[PDB]
Curated annotation (Swiss-Prot):
Regulates ARP2/3 complex-mediated actin assembly. Recruits ARP2/3 complex to sides of preexisting actin filaments, which may promote nucleation or stabilization of filament branches. Binds to actin filaments, but not actin monomers. Actin binding is required for ARP2/3 complex activation. May also have a role in linking the actin cytoskeleton to endocytosis. recruits components of the endocytotic machinery to cortical actin patches, known sites of endocytosis. The gene is ABP1. The actin depolymerizing factor homology (ADF) domain mediates actin filament binding. It comes from the Eukaryota. It comes from Saccharomyces cerevisiae (strain ATCC 204508 / S288c). Present with 606 molecules/cell in log phase SD medium. Binds F-actin, but not G-actin. Interacts with the ARP2/3 complex. Interacts with APP1, ARK1, PRK1, SCP1, SRV2 and YIR003W via its SH3 domain. Interacts with the SH3 domain of RVS167 and with SLA1. The chain holds residues 535 to 592 of 592 of the full protein. Sequence repeats lie at residues 33-42. This is Actin-binding protein. Belongs to the ABP1 family. It is found in: Cytoplasm, Cytoskeleton, Actin patch. Residues 2-59 form the SH3 domain.
């Protein structure tokens, strides 16, 4: 369960999707799918699906 940084801004288009901006951290990443992962935002505790190509693990 690693954390990641936000490479690009990603806007959720669904209720179960996380919304975040570049440089936000996403924590407790769960390998739900090869392309999309489920995590939680460091900044507010919200949880949801996020696309992997928008983040990079670690700092």
């Amino acid at each position: 369960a690693p954390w990641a940084t936000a490479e690009y801004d990603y806007d959720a288009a669904e209720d179960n999707e996380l919304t975040f901006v570049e440089n936000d951290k996403i924590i407790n990443i769960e390998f739900v799918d090869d392309d999309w992962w489920l995590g939680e935002l460091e900044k507010d505790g919200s949880k949801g699906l996020f696309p992997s190509n928008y983040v990079s693990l670690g700092n």
